[PDB]
Design a binder for this molecule. Structure first.
Ligand SMILES: Nc1ncnc2c1ncn2[C@@H]1O[C@H](COP(=O)(O)OP(=O)(O)O)[C@@H](O)[C@H]1O
Ligand SMILES: Nc1ncnc2c1ncn2[C@@H]1O[C@H](COP(=O)(O)OP(=O)(O)O)[C@@H](O)[C@H]1O
Ligand SMILES: [Mg+2]
Ligand SMILES: [Mg+2]
Lengths: 525, 540, 49, 98
């Protein structure tokens, strides 16, 4: 390094190239993976991360943990990216993707160290991934009966398997039934915004409920609100986007008068405008009035005098859910409040829910939405419950799209590893080593399951390999029995697309990391 | 044992993974569990001294030096300045118990601390924490079923309030207001029963106004079946007392009307000025005449008024109150049976509320005046007026009465009770131990630990009352086993008997169930956490 | 024209799942309630609605 | 922007609303559909009215998209939907496409 009088790049530019930088990248990926290792399986644990502000978060979800980590290593960020991608496309398996990617990299690390050309490794990974995806598609069990009870049982089992790793795993049957019931009421797009999730502090987990309708918190009632009745046995709901207040007609409106009679007439005209809006609403026949915009004290007292219910500043999402549950239309003008644009529910009620007041719209027969009310002892308790239910909801949605399942608990990975090893035994031998390494890396999932559960991973892996080679497709880790079992009859079911996407994303990330030969960092500005 | 790992690569090149990783810290494995258990044990041991009738208070000081003396566990934990995350979890647990039930905020913390204490030795014996959590969950299920089995139903009707009085008394026994014990219990019961939807529906708390003024005596606290208002009559010369007042609630300021829209009234000649002045004078006279025409005796406004209106009200024998807050307007309208009127043009006789007596009340050598609206016909709103020797006991009385109201509300929601004094915990522990004898071996340890942790409440009660904990608890448990009587507890007050059914120690069943459930869930969370990643930067 | 070829990057399903669409894709949502038209009659306005 | 009254009346008459932020996207859509960007709220004449085989809202991955789909194997503008497991990978694929 002779110091050139004028250096090429900016001073402070760091460049690392060759084998050592790739080995360092593999080590960084290992470091990222080991931060989420213990959160895998029914014996997995939770991680607590405290940000700079001191607001802690507790999660069993791999994507959440990785996002909360301030990863700055350029090669390590790929694992976080693929975790986010798996969360977006599937919603479950955000730990499996990272574990598989890091295990691929660790398996091929010795070959990289001895000067093997990375293009060969990339080609071997792509070949193995294509074969594994085809095998998953081929051996996935699908039921071509179109039986409603069978489909419901499949969805419930998939939701239970997705949920049996969180703090709500004790009530996993209850929560899976609730999730399946919630999802099956969505019409055709299965939009997440049509499933409300409300977190109300205090109460046991079993106190959580799913309302066949819509529910939301009471929103800053004005004076005279307590004089309104709080229960109706067949209300008509007037969904509105209207500000029912005494205000200027327009912000740029100016009134110019030169007579006291005109002054009184103007005051009476403002009052008459407000009362005309209120009278149209009242004569529409509705009993419950909800507005996206504020409703003033005058309107609140007006509705109280008519034995009506009013609520202003209702959030837009809650109004859309009320539309979907009751079947009306949000009206920005009250001039045409025909019976068709009015919502209808059997029972409306305001009740006490754990130190808060909520409005309940129940008895909707044509409902296309639902609202989860989650009870817990702490904010992070309810947050983790919401994350777990989101995982279950995504799994149920994907299973609705296509009902193809593969037994979990490491069964699918073991079968794929056996298939890939059998294939690799029948190729020249440069690709054979790498495909065998891929197959060996596939064994990370049952090994990590056994490690988290506290078993002896080696003996369980040997038994699993012997069972798969001898015959049997769905044999995996049995956590409770300290042994192995046919995970298909144990109803450890996951959709095939979860593993398909996991393998695809892990392979793509491993190939991307391997293909990089030099890292250059410019000085910060 | 921090900053994750440190390698700097096998080749010596820099190895930076996480932003500011050299300054962050982390705890992994069983050490994190032990630290969390230690923190929770510290919090629970601090809190357990404030448990029972002989429990002592904690004097809490905030940032600005203001001091509150209290026995409420939720308040103590809310005002506590903690930094450990597990301590914050304990605080949230206590707040959750307060929100759902309103009583038992001290019990949940002690129970969770005991559960984690037992889990500590269970972990040291080589058991996976998830196994401990599952055993705790199934033991809690058994305990809740037993609690449901040994409960008793009480009458929640107006004619016979004695069980309700006893329940409120049991709630208030540990608070400093026990010097007026039955009086506070009775006023809380009457307040809840007055403002309550009959068909087992909710009790709406904003219909209960809790107001405290210093001076007087704590025994002077009384229940007002009406509204107490911090305001007084607008003019100094209107009478201080109105009999059979016909209230006229208004939300229109007694001022000339003003449009909301930007407006300009043009005066272009002397005739315009004369017309404007006549309009103002006639508007004042017209509004006063409109108020008087309904036959009203009193006028209540929300936005105040000006001098001409004030003197016209005084001249027409119409006492008035101005600047009354919106919640107070709503409470007055609800209690008196009148309707809130937005303008004088809509004021009619049918919208006038009725109050038997409206009076202005002085408070000694203080010049402060407060207005009483009571003797309503069928007042659906109630007010509690608290007096005391200093503001600290006033705040403590406020929260104690809130606890009593919450307990009576819970009783309204569900009328099943269990006998406290440690009897419920002893019976639940006995049931858990009996069930554990039939369970497979591995979960037996977790269930036995749960039973031992349940046994801590009678231990704390006996220790706080000066008795020997182990001997007393063992004797009571043996008596409960030998004769089937789940009502035997810890004689904290030394009344000479252990039967809490005779001593009238009553607890809401749902309160106990919520205690056990919340403690189990928080313990499960704390056991499930095995990794901490704090910034560790210790900024200013 | 090179600019007549637009590229939309939607994350998640592996690059083998990419496809070509004869039209355009916008990563946004509809303002109103109607969310699907089978015989579209688009009327474009450059002014605020 | 879309006014509230205008949105309500469009919902009354079953009209799909799409709001394009960038004028470049507006011009590209006009090219690919065959419409003329009117400057006022006047109803469009038959020449200025755009046509398409199908416009619908759909979700790909976790992003909601609005698709203007032609059934014919023709059009002024065609688009490629790139999938992938990483943002950087999709950017590199976009460079290859360029
Ligand atoms: N009851 C069970 N028995 C054995 N294995 C299970 C069981 N439930 C889940 N698993 C396995 O745990 C693995 C991780 O699942 P989970 O932690 O819930 O989500 P993620 O895949 O995001 O880590 C899955 O691969 C699944 O096969
Ligand atoms: N007269 C009494 N005799 C025996 N035990 C009592 C008596 N009164 C209350 N206790 C017990 O004291 C415990 C503490 O009650 P308290 O401190 O008022 O509220 P918390 O349950 O929040 O601690 C209760 O669990 C109750 O069983
Ligand atoms: Mg999962
Ligand atoms: Mg108490």
């Amino acid at each position: 390094m002779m110091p050139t009088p004028v250096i090429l790049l900016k001073e402070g530019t760091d460049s690392s190239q060759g084998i050592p930088q790739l080995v360092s990248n593999i080590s960084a990926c290992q470091v990222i993976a080991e931060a989420v290792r213990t959160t895998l399986g029914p014996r997995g644990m939770d991680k607590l991360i405290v940000d700079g502000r001191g607001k802690a978060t507790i999660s069993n979800d791999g994507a959440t943990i990785l996002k909360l980590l301030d990863v700055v290593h350029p090669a390590a960020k790929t694992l976080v990216d693929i975790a986010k991608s798996q969360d977006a496309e599937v919603g479950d398996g955000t730990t499996s993707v990272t574990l598989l990617a890091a295990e691929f990299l660790k398996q091929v690390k010795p070959y990289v160290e001895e000067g093997l050309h990375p293009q060969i490794i990339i080609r071997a990974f792509r070949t193995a991934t294509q074969l594994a995806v085809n095998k998953i598609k081929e051996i996935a069990v699908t039921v071509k009966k179109a039986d409603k009870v069978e489909q419901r049982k499949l969805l419930e089992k998939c939701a239970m398997t997705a949920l049996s790793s969180k703090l709500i795993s004790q009530q996993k049957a209850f929560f899976a039934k609730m999730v399946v019931d919630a999802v099956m009421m969505l019409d055709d797009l299965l939009q997440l915004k049509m499933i409300g999730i409300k977190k109300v502090q205090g109460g046991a987990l079993e106190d959580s409920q799913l309302v066949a309708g819509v529910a939301f918190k009471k929103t800053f009632s004005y004076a005279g609100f307590e004089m309104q009745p709080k229960k109706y046995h067949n209300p008509k709901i007037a969904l509105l986007n209207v500000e029912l207040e005494l205000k200027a007609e327009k912000d740029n409106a100016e009134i110019r008068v030169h007579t006291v009679e005109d002054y009184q007439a103007i005051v009476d005209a403002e009052w008459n405008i407000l009362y005309d809006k209120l009278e149209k609403i009242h004569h529409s026949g509705a009993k419950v009035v909800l507005s996206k915009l504020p409703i003033g004290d005058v309107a609140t007292q007006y509705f109280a005098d008519r034995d009506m219910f009013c609520a202003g500043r209702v959030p837009e999402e809650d109004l859309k859910r009320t539309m979907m549950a009751c079947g009306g239309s949000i009206q920005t003008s009250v001039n045409a409040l025909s019976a068709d644009v009015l919502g209808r529910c059997q029972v409306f009620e305001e009740t006490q829910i754990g130190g808060e007041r909520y409005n309940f719209f129940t008895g909707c027969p044509k409902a296309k939405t639902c609202t989860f009310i989650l009870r817990g002892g702490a904010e992070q308790f309810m947050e983790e419950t919401e994350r777990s239910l989101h995982d279950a909801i995504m799994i149920v949605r994907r299973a609705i799209k296509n009902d193809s399942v593969v037994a979990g608990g490491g069964a699918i990975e073991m079968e794929l590893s056996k298939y890939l090893r059998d294939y690799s035994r029948t190729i020249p031998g440069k690709q054979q080593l790498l495909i065998g390494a891929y197959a060996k890396a596939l064994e990370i999932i049952p090994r990590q399951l056994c490690d988290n559960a506290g078993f002896d991973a080696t003996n369980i892996l040997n038994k699993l390999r012997a069972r798969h080679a001898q015959g049997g497709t769905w044999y995996g880790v049995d956590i409770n029995n300290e042994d192995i079992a046919d995970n298909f009859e144990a109803f450890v079911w996951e959709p095939a697309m979860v593993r398909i996407n996991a393998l695809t994303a892990a392979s793509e990330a491993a190939c991307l990391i391997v293909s990089v030969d030099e890292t250059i960092k410019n000085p910060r500005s | 044992a921090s900053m994750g790992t440190l390698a700097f690569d096998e080749y010596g090149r820099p190895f930076l993974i996480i932003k500011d990783q050299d300054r962050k810290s982390r705890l992994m494995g069983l050490e994190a569990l032990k630290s969390h258990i230690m923190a929770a044990k510290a919090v629970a041991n601090t809190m357990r001294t404030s448990l029972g009738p002989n429990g002592l208070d904690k004097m809490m000081v905030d940032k600005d030096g203001d001091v509150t003396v209290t026995n409420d566990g939720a308040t103590i934990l809310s005002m506590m300045d903690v930094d450990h995350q597990i301590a914050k979890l304990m605080v949230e647990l206590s707040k959750s118990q307060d929100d759902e039930i309103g009583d038992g905020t001290t019990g949940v913390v002690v129970l969770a601390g005991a559960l984690l204490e037992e889990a500590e030795q269970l972990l040291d014996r080589g058991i996976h924490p998830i196994r401990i959590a599952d055993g705790y969950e199934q033991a809690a299920r058994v305990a809740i079923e037993h609690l449901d089995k040994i409960s008793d139903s009480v009458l929640v009707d107006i004619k016979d309030t004695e069980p309700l009085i006893q329940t409120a008394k049991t709630t208030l026994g540990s608070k400093v207001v026990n010097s007026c014990h039955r009086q506070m219990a009775e006023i809380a019961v009457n307040a809840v029963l007055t403002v309550a939807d009959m068909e087992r529906r909710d009790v709406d708390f904003e219909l209960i106004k809790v107001e405290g003024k210093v001076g007087g005596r704590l025994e002077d606290t009384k229940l007002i079946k009406g509204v107490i208002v911090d305001k007084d009559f607008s003019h100094p010369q209107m009478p201080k007392k109105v009999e059979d007042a016909k209230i006229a609630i208004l939300t229109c300021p007694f001022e000339p009307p003003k449009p909301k829209t930007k407006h300009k009234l043009d005066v272009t000649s002397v005739e315009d000025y004369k017309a404007l002045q006549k309009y103002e004078k006639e508007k004042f006279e017209e509004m006063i005449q409109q108020i008087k025409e309904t036959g009203a005796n009193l006028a209540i406004c929300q936005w105040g008024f000006d001098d001409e209106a004030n003197h016209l009200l005084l001249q027409n024998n119409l006492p008035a109150v101005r600047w009354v807050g919106g919640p107070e307007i709503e409470l007055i309208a609800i209690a008196t049976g009148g309707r809130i009127v937005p303008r004088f043009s809509e004021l009619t006789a049918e919208k006038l509320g009725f109050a038997g007596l409206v009076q202005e009340i002085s408070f000694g050598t203080t010049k402060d005046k407060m207005l009483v609206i009571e003797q309503c016909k069928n007042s659906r709103a109630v007010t509690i007026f608290i007096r005391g020797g200093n503001k600290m006991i006033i705040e403590e009385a406020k929260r104690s009465l809130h606890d009593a109201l919450c307990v009576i509300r819970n009783l309204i929601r569900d009328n099943r009770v269990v006998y406290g004094g440690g009897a419920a915990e002893i019976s639940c522990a006995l049931a858990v131990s009996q069930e554990a004898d039939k369970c497979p071996t591995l979960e037996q340890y977790a269930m036995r630990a749960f039973a031992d942790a349940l046994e801590v409440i009678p231990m704390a009660l006996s220790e706080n009352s000066g008795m020997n904990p182990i001997q007393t608890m063992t004797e009571v448990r043996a008596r409960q086993v030998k004769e089937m009587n789940p009502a035997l507890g810890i004689d904290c007050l030394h009344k000479g008997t252990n039967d809490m059914k005779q001593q009238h120690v009553i607890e809401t069943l749902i309160g106990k169930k919520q205690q056990i459930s919340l403690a189990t869930q928080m313990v499960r969370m704390i056991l499930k956490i095995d990794d901490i990643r704090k910034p560790g930067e210790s900024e200013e | 024209n090179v600019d007549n070829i637009r590229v939309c990057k939607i994350l998640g399903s592996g690059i083998s799942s990419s496809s070509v669409l004869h039209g355009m894709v916008f990563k946004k949502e509809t303002e109103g309630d109607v969310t699907s038209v089978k015989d579209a009659k688009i009327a474009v306005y450059s002014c605020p609605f | 922007k879309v006014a509230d009254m205008a949105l309500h009346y469009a919902n009354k008459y079953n009209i799909m609303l799409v709001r394009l932020n960038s004028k470049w996207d507006l011009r590209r859509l006009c090219k690919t559909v065959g419409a003329t960007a009117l400057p006022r709220l006047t109803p469009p004449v038959l020449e200025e009215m755009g046509h398409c085989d199908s416009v619908y809202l759909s979700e790909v991955g976790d992003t909601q998209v609005v698709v203007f789909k032609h059934e014919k194997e023709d059009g002024a503008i065609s688009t490629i939907v790139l999938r992938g497991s990483t943002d950087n990978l999709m950017d590199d694929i976009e460079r290859a496409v360029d």
